[PDB]
Structure 1
Amino acid sequence: MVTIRLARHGAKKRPFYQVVVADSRNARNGRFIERVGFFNPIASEKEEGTRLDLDRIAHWVGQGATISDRVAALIKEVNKAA
């Protein structure tokens, strides 16, 4: 089962999630097929916090792919006007 989930990179107390497309059996920072963006939760109110290549994400859900609760939340958070 291919999953689109967050691989936690970055330093201690400064997380940086890479929105990545990996098999469910692999580890969190382990193997993947593709990375399709990133997510910076500590990027507070400055210029840029998150970026997801939604065309490649919509390509993988067409092949059949579950998405995590955060990845489903960031896809919602890039709104119709925002």
Structure 2
Amino acid sequence: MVKIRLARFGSKHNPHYRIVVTDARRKRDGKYIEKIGYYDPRKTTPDWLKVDVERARYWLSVGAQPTDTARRLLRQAGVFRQE
């Protein structure tokens, strides 16, 4: 199935991830279906997480499955906040 997961993009000791949609079977850094966010785990800037809940919600609706820290990040942007 298609996943929502992290793609490692920074540099040696400088991790930045792209939050991506992709078939589970790509390499982690290979061709992805759509970037739908980014994550800087060092919080080196004020702007260290970013999602696009609209698209995130889209891919969930067609059954993308997010990895365990992708969903954590998605939640942190209120992808799932329903109230």
TM range (shorter): 0.7 to 0.9
Contact conserved, 2:21 with 2:64, CA < 8 A, in 1?
A: no
The answer for unaligned runs of 5 or more in structure 1 is none
* Counterpart Cα distance in 2 of 1:78 and 1:31: 25
- Compute the displacement of 1:73 (Å): 0.3
Partner of 2:54: 55
* Counterpart Cα distance in 1 of 2:72 and 2:25: 22
The number of residues matched between the two structures is 79
The answer for unaligned runs of 5 or more in structure 2 is none
- Structure 1's consecutive aligned runs of 4 or more residues displaced over 3 angstroms after TM superposition are none
* Counterpart Cα distance in 2 of 1:67 and 1:30: 17
- Compute the displacement of 1:78 (Å): 2.5
Q: Deviations over 1:42-65 (max 9, x none)?
A: 124x42110001110110111111
| TM-score for the superposition, normalised by structure 2 | 0.87
Between the aligned residues of both structures, percent identity stands at 35
